[PDB]
């Protein structure tokens, strides 16, 4: 069902669309059944759980059937399988955290092999498909790399990965002296 990727660090909104009499009772959970946050009656209710100082919701749309569920600092142990019950709606949404970093410092000098990694979480090998103002690519997934490195790089390289059918793009900075 829905395949939601996110980016290390940054904040998602996973959907829950209603199909009832608009505004209702409703809760968002993570995959063993620990509430993450719902409604004590006309208000938000966030329950204790590892995301609560960074979980919330858009209750302004809890008027419209939509009741979203928002997390920030996305962190890659962040992704597994939420569900939002909406009266008598169950509705599966599987959060795949992507983090790509550069191993090395995002910074290098004209020569030497320039490597990244793709830090993934509790469930997957994803693919990345790195390209670089100077038109290639790498290929693979958690390491990648290069060799030699043409000066013409402090510019911006486009990074991108796609899961279950769906995708996002780290697009990078990089440095190469002389």
């Known amino acids: 069902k829905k395949v939601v990727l996110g980016k290390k660090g940054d904040t ?4 829950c669309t209603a199909s009832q009499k608009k505004s209702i009772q409703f ?10 946050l719902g409604n004590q009656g006309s208000f938000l209710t966030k329950g204790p759980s590892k ?33 939002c019950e909406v009266e008598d709606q169950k509705e599966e949404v ?9 191993n090395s410092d995002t910074h290098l000098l004209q020569g030497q092999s320039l490597t990244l990694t793709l830090e993934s979480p509790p469930g997957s090998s994803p693919s990345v498909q790195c390209r670089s103002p100077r038109g290639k690519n790498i290929q693979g997934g958690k390491t990648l790399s290069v060799s030699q490195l043409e000066l013409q ?20 900075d990089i440095v190469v002296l002389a």
């Open 12 to 15: 998602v909104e996973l959907t």
């Open 51 to 83: 995301l609560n100082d960074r979980a919330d919701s858009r209750r302004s749309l809890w008027d419209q059937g939509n009741f979203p569920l928002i997390i920030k600092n996305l962190k890659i142990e962040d992704s597994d399988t939420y569900i």
């Open 153 to 172: 790089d402090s510019g911006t390289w486009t990074c991108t990965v796609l899961q279950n059918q769906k995708k996002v793009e780290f697009k990078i």
């Open 27 to 36: 809760h968002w959970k993570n995959s063993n059944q620990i509430k993450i």
């Open 94 to 102: 599987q959060l795949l955290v992507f983090g790509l970093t550069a």
